[PDB]
Amino acid sequence: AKRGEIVDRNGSGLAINKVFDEVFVPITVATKDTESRYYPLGEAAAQLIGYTGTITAEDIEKNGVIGKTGLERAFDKELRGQDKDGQTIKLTIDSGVQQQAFAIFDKRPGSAVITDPQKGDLLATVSSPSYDPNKMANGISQKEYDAYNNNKDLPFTARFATGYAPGSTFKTITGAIGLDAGTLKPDEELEINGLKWQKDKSWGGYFATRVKEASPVNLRTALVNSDNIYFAQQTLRMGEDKFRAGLNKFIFGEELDLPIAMTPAQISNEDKFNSEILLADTGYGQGQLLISPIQQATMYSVFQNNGTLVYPKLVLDKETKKKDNVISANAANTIATDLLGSVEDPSGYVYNMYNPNFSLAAKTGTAEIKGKENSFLLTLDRSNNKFLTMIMVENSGENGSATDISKPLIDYLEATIK
Numbered sequence: 001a002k003r004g005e006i007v008d009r010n011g012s013g014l015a016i017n018k019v020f021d022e023v024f025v026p027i028t029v030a031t032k033d034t035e036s037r038y039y040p041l042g043e044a045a046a047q048l049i050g051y052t053g054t055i056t057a058e059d060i061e062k063n064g065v066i067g068k069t070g071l072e073r074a075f076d077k078e079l080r081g082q083d084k085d086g087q088t089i090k091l092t093i094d095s096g097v098q099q100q101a102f103a104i105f106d107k108r109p110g111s112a113v114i115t116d117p118q119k120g121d122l123l124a125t126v127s128s129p130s131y132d133p134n135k136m137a138n139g140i141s142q143k144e145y146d147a148y149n150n151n152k153d154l155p156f157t158a159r160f161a162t163g164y165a166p167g168s169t170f171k172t173i174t175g176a177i178g179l180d181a182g183t184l185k186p187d188e189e190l191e192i193n194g195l196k197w198q199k200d201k202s203w204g205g206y207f208a209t210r211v212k213e214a215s216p217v218n219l220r221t222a223l224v225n226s227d228n229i230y231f232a233q234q235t236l237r238m239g240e241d242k243f244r245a246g247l248n249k250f251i252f253g254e255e256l257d258l259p260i261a262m263t264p265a266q267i268s269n270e271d272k273f274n275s276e277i278l279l280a281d282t283g284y285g286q287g288q289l290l291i292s293p294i295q296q297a298t299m300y301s302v303f304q305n306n307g308t309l310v311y312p313k314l315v316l317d318k319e320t321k322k323k324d325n326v327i328s329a330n331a332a333n334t335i336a337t338d339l340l341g342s343v344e345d346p347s348g349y350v351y352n353m354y355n356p357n358f359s360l361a362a363k364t365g366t367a368e369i370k371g372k373e374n375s376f377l378l379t380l381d382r383s384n385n386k387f388l389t390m391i392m393v394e395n396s397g398e399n400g401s402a403t404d405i406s407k408p409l410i411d412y413l414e415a416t417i418k
């Protein structure tokens with residue numbers, strides 16, 4: 001039986017079969033014609049699609065080829081058939097978006113998740129660096145394989161499913177929670193002097209620090225300037241109960257119906273912060289938050305659905321599933337409108353991607369890990385609400401920011417997905 005195909009949303013192949021003339025024990029391509037598993041996108045979708053391998057003795061313990069990793073293994077039952085050819089599985093992936101999202105990294109460690117925010121379609125799930133899935137499935141030498149395993153940037157890992165601290169992009173949720181709680185007034189002008197702030201001397205040598213000097217600061221200025229002090233103060237103003245009440249309406253601790261293994265997102269290590277510092281850190285995306293890029297794109301989907309959360313989906317014919325009224329419609333549109341300044345204001349961090357013919361909201365972020373720094377970029381299509389991007393660059397202190405590489409992807413999406 002011929003193994004079933006994995007195709008993208010347009011029917012283009014992602015995991016298919018192709019006949020080669022191999023130079024009987026086939027080694028490499030030239031003598032005998034054999035059918036081999038082929039991946040047209042190669043490393044661009046290696047971690048997602050995975051690769052196949054020969055059935056081993058340990059596999060036959062839980063009663064041809066079998067999917068070893070990725071969707072080849074998760075869908076191995078439906079794909080392998082029975083010798084009835086295997087079934088064809090059509091994904092939400094867009095091959096053009098998948099290849100563009102992978103090209104921007106250029107061996108930099110990071111990930112990119114592009115979604116249809118109103119339907120949950122995962123248009124692209126990219127992890128960098130990557131590996132050749134055709135060689136892993138049909139013949140890789142110990143030299144090339146050891147180069148993958150000794151790569152400290154870990155190309156085999158699926159970074160879009162790994163949990164990270166979200167960074168300053170998380171301020172969009174903290175601000176929306178503050179709006180619905182009634183403690184955050186969008187027009188209130190907060191006096192903030194200097195670059196560091198603590199509640200009082202009980203914080204010791206720790207301060208919430210910002211990068212830009214500005215006063216007074218309202219909600220929109222705090223988002224565009226990415227002011228940590230404003231959001232640390234607003235988080236302490238609302239309190240842990242009001243803060244967690246809004247956070248708990250998101251998908252924290254919730255396993256998703258995605259064929260991708262993923263630890264659920266968490267707010268902190270325990271049910272209580274037991275620290276004003278930890279409560280304030282969580283307000284601007286640090287602390288003990290662990291959210292994967294797929295989970296981040298899911299949480300941030302509320303700003304393009306009038307406060308409704310749209311769950312992600314990878315299989316095209318799967319019905320859209322939502323979580324209603326995670327935040328209010330007024331809070332979602334207030335935050336999304338304020339994020340237009342990140343792209344449209346000449347001093348905004350995403351002004352490099354400014355397009356006078358397209359409405360793009362955005363929010364950047366740099367997380368400090370116990371150190372190293374990761375860069376994040378969230379963009380929101382506000383012209384038609386047809387795409388959402390969650391882009392991350394690991395070790396941004398050496399690899400640069402996500403904003404510095406993501407413009408060709410955003411330009412591609414504004415002309416294609418629109």
Ligand SMILES: *C(=O)[C@@H](NC(=O)Cc1ccccc1)[C@@H]1N[C@@H](C(=O)O)C(C)(C)S1
Nearest residue numbers: 167168169211226228364365366367368
């Ligand atoms: C949000 O993530 C904020 N980041 C920090 O407070 C930590 C940090 C890391 C490196 C340098 C300075 C501060 C602010 N948002 C990011 C961002 O948008 O890239 C800033 C670096 C502007 S700070």
Ligand SMILES: [Cl-]
Nearest residue numbers: 313314315318
């Ligand atoms: Cl799915």
Ligand SMILES: [Cl-]
Nearest residue numbers: 342349363364
């Ligand atoms: Cl920003």
